[PDB]
Amino acid sequence: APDIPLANVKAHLTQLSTIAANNGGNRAHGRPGYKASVDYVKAKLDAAGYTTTLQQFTSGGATGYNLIANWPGGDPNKVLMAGAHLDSVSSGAGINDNGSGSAAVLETALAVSRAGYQPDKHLRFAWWGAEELGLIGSKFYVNNLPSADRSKLAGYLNFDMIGSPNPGYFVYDDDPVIEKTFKNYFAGLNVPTEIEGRSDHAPFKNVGVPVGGLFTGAGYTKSAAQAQKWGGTAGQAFDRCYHSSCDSLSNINDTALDRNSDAAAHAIWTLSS
Ligand SMILES: N[C@H](Cc1c[nH]c2ccccc12)C(=O)O
Numbered sequence: 001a002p003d004i005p006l007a008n009v010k011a012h013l014t015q016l017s018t019i020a021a022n023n024g025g026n027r028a029h030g031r032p033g034y035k036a037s038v039d040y041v042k043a044k045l046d047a048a049g050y051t052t053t054l055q056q057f058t059s060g061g062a063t064g065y066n067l068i069a070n071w072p073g074g075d076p077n078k079v080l081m082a083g084a085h086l087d088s089v090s091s092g093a094g095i096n097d098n099g100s101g102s103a104a105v106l107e108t109a110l111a112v113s114r115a116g117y118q119p120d121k122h123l124r125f126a127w128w129g130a131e132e133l134g135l136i137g138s139k140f141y142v143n144n145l146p147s148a149d150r151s152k153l154a155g156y157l158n159f160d161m162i163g164s165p166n167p168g169y170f171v172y173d174d175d176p177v178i179e180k181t182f183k184n185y186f187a188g189l190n191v192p193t194e195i196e197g198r199s200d201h202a203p204f205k206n207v208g209v210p211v212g213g214l215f216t217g218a219g220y221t222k223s224a225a226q227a228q229k230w231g232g233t234a235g236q237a238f239d240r241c242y243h244s245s246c247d248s249l250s251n252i253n254d255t256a257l258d259r260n261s262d263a264a265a266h267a268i269w270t271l272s273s
């Protein structure tokens with residue numbers, strides 16, 4: 001797998017920040033900042049060679065969208081998916097929640113094209129709408145994916161809040177192979193990890209698709225032992241700006257975003273062979 005350039009991930013975050021500022025301060029479902037976010041990500045993927053689909057749904061009286069991007073080729077009976085919700089709450093720009101995961105998944109998708117990678121498994125990336133309404137976009141996707149296509153899914157990897165400013169390094173404790181792949185990446189860095197309905201992997205998990213993911217913490221407070229292993233500040237939230245107007249470009253830990261973006265790519269490469 002390639003090393004995902006941190007600067008490229010941060011440049012996507014800058015673009016999402018600007019989109020929020022241009023659209024009433026947020027990127028929330030039903031509001032123009034969300035669809036502008038979708039248009040940004042879709043344009044980068046289309047230029048890289050992806051087959052993109054805008055999947056529309058209605059929730060709360062407003063049109064929502066999922067962005068699905070298929071990398072042409074690979075075994076159609078073995079699909080590896082990775083995704084991230086692209087909506088924010090309406091109080092702010094949602095840069096850590098969940099620009100961070102959205103930008104890491106986008107840069108990994110772009111890295112696939114730059115590397116000329118041809119995975120054995122077919123690769124599909126997704127950016128979910130309306131996660132903050134209750135996983136509505138990922139539920140819509142799973143609910144509308146026929147059972148023959150669900151059975152072709154080898155895994156779903158989720159990335160939701162991966163740049164928290166006072167981070168932990170949490171790995172989902174779900175499918176054992178996906179979990180081992182992430183934990184092995186961090187082991188090679190000599191960075192400890194801890195085991196993690198809270199995000200878009202839940203609709204996949206609930207229908208028996210193997211899932212896993214990365215998380216750097218939200219509203220809970222970092223313990224003394226966690227500050228010993230990862231630095232930062234004991235007694236403060238992992239993300240002091242969770243769901244807040246201050247979930248801005250200032251609300252990112254660059255080391256965590258870099259490591260988790262690199263880990264995302266490592267897992268996507270490893271699990272697609
Ligand atoms: N509620 C999620 C953030 C979140 C909190 N705990 C977890 C565990 C696993 C994934 C995500 C989360 C959100 O608003 O994005």
Ligand SMILES: [Ca+2]
Pocket residue numbers: 003004005006258259262
């Ligand atoms: Ca990197």
Ligand SMILES: [Zn+2]
Pocket residue numbers: 085097098131160161199
């Ligand atoms: Zn989130």
Ligand SMILES: [Zn+2]
Pocket residue numbers: 089097132243
């Ligand atoms: Zn959230």
